[PDB]
Amino acid sequence: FNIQELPTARKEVFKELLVNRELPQTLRDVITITDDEHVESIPALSYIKDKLATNGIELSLNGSSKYFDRREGHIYTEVADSVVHGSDRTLDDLLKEIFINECVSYETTLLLDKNNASGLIDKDNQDLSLYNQGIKEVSNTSMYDGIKQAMKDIPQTFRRKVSVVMNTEHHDKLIKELAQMGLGTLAGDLTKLFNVSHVVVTDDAQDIFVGDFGHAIYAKYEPIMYNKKKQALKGVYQFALNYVFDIKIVPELLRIVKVK
């Protein structure tokens, strides 16, 4: 029969390709990921719930049937012309610039977007919005005072590992609110101001999040196939990759913030 499997020795090139932390501004800095086929459920779940049970809180099964499910991912590109392919190096670095950017961006849309369980995001990929997941809100006028209240309702067991996410439109704010109350020098060193690790700032996020993203947002990717084809009318190729992904949430450790 004609079909040939992708050589396994070529696969691990793509395993480290799908998962990468090199980029500046993503939740990939803080969340957990992997590439292992064998794992079937969040590995640490048992150590979590009992420690939560030490407190009055314990888990509601917000995710049904913890065992993962296989959701599909797809990529497509068109190189401009064989002249790019006539050479070697600029080709190879061009592709890796693309995929990482596309893969990383795509999971990010599913989580943070205001698309909120409809519209552009496929209805197949439609539960996983955090707004749609059922986190409880915190509110306050002062954003500085606001998130102290929210870091501190967290269970004190996992308070040591927590990280805040923020929009640049929010970033410009607090440094203003600080200056009026002083601590201008302290401002610009957010990690010191609020004891936290890995503070993050981006622009796709619309509202402020807090919580231990190390244990909550476990995920895994696995490649399947990499295809290649010539197209003769144009000078172009048709490169593409398709893979499988899936992801989970533990909303109790997380808290959203909403200032007025």
Binding site: N2, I3, H74, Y76, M225, N227, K229, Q238, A240, N242
Partner: protein, 41 residues
Amino acid sequence: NYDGTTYDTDKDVKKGEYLFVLTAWYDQQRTLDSAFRIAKA
């Protein structure tokens, strides 16, 4: 009458599919019309 057949393979990268197509040519016909009649209510 089946006169000839041709079979070939390719890929559709955008959707991932393989096609596995087959094309051929044939004719059928009634030698005479007084052979094959129709009933009706």
